[PDB]
Structures are given as structure tokens and as C-alpha cells.
């Protein structure tokens, strides 16, 4: 049938342009990532303003909590908030995964207290708390009970 092939060809141009751009953007983030500077690497992705690149980056760093430093949380937490409001369920889950890692790794010590880093980190966590209040979000609400 000719219509089904026409169905396939419609979305091709979009796919090609989207995958090429994200690949360029990923190359930029990886060129900084290979420096060893995780923070500037994530700051680079955020500056690129491409959320799909932030999701790919978070899926990577979320696998190793020992890569996270307190400084990185002040950059990530605004993205988590962005991701928690996404229409895509996979974007929301990446946000929950990252937020869990931050809560479990960093919420103590942040409580026990650079003081500005904890101060900034805490207010970011407070606005996210409000968002989670209004499943993954139920568990997160229990995790942010403070």
C-alpha cells in the first residue's frame, strides 16, 4: 500500500533534524565531561537549554552517586523541577531518580549544617516539596517530610 509508506516518510525529516541536533549538543557536553569537571559539564548542558540532553545526561550521572558533589545539586534541582512537570512519564521518572539520589546522599549533612551551598540547596528542595505535594510523587512526598 502507498498510504502506509507515505505515513512512514512524513516523520523522517523531523527525526533526522532532531537526532542530529541532540548529537551535536551531546558532543559538546561530552567534550567538557571528559575534562573531569562534572559540574561545568552539567552547567554546559543546562546552558544549551536542550532538555532532552539534560535527560540523557541525568540518566548517566544517576547511575553513580559518588560522582555527585554538593555543588552539582544547585544546578540539578531546577531541572528536576522542570522534569517533574513534564508530560513524558520517562522525564518525570528521571527527575524522581535524581531527586532520590540527592535526598539520600545530601539531605543529611545539609540538615547538619559552603553553608550557602546548603542554604541554596535547601530552598530549592523546599519549592520542590510544594510541587510534589500537589506513585512516584507520593513516595517523594514522604521522602521530603521535613
Amino acid at each position: 500500500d502507498e498510504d502506509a509508506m507515505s505515513q512512514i516518510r512524513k516523520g523522517h525529516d523531523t527525526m533526522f533534524v532532531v537526532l542530529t541536533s541532540r548529537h551535536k549538543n551531546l558532543d559538546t557536553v561530552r567534550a567538557v565531561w571528559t575534562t573531569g569537571d562534572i559540574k561545568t559539564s552539567v552547567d554546559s548542558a543546562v546552558a544549551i537549554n536542550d532538555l532532552s540532553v539534560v535527560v540523557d545526561l541525568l540518566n548517566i550521572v544517576n547511575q553513580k552517586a559518588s560522582l555527585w558533589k554538593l555543588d552539582l545539586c544547585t544546578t540539578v534541582l531546577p531541572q528536576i523541577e522542570k522534569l517533574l512537570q513534564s508530560k513524558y512519564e520517562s522525564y518525570v521518572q528521571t527527575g524522581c531518580t535524581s531527586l532520590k539520589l540527592i535526598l539520600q546522599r545530601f539531605l543529611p549533612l545539609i540538615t547538619d549544617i559552603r553553608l550557602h551551598k546548603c542554604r541554596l540547596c535547601f530552598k530549592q528542595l523546599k519549592s520542590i516539596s510544594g510541587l510534589v505535594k500537589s506513585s512516584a510523587f507520593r513516595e517523594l512526598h514522604l521522602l521530603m517530610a521535613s
Partner: protein, 65 residues
């Protein structure tokens, strides 16, 4: 099936767009296996998208943890 091929191309593209590149490659590879002058063009275009997901996968794996 004709529809099944249109089905799996949509899945490949949906997975590629959402960052599930591993799942996307599986649907991209399966569709390519199942695949008249315009039909040859369709295969070339899907083969291009497939190699692009592969190149993205190669870049993501180059992130050393």
C-alpha cells in the same frame, strides 16, 4: 505486516525521541529486517535514523563514570 511495520517505525521513533536509545535500536533493526521505488527510499530514510541513534549511543557510552 504493512501496518505492523508502520507500528514499529512509530515505536522506534518514539523511543529515539525520548532517549530510550537501546529500545529504539531494537525497533529500528527489526523494521529494517522486514523491509516499489518509493519503498526503497523509505528503507534508506529509516536506515539513516537508525545509524543516528547508533552514533548517539556511541557518544553516551563514551561518558566514563
Amino acid at each position: 505486516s504493512l501496518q505492523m511495520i508502520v507500528e514499529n517505525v512509530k515505536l522506534a521513533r518514539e523511543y529515539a525521541l525520548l532517549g530510550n536509545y537501546d529500545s529504539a535500536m531494537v525497533y529500528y533493526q527489526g523494521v529494517l529486517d522486514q523491509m516499489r521505488q518509493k519503498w526503497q527510499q523509505v528503507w534508506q530514510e529509516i536506515n539513516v535514523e537508525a545509524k543516528q541513534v547508533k552514533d548517539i549511543m556511541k557518544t553516551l557510552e563514551s561518558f566514563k563514570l
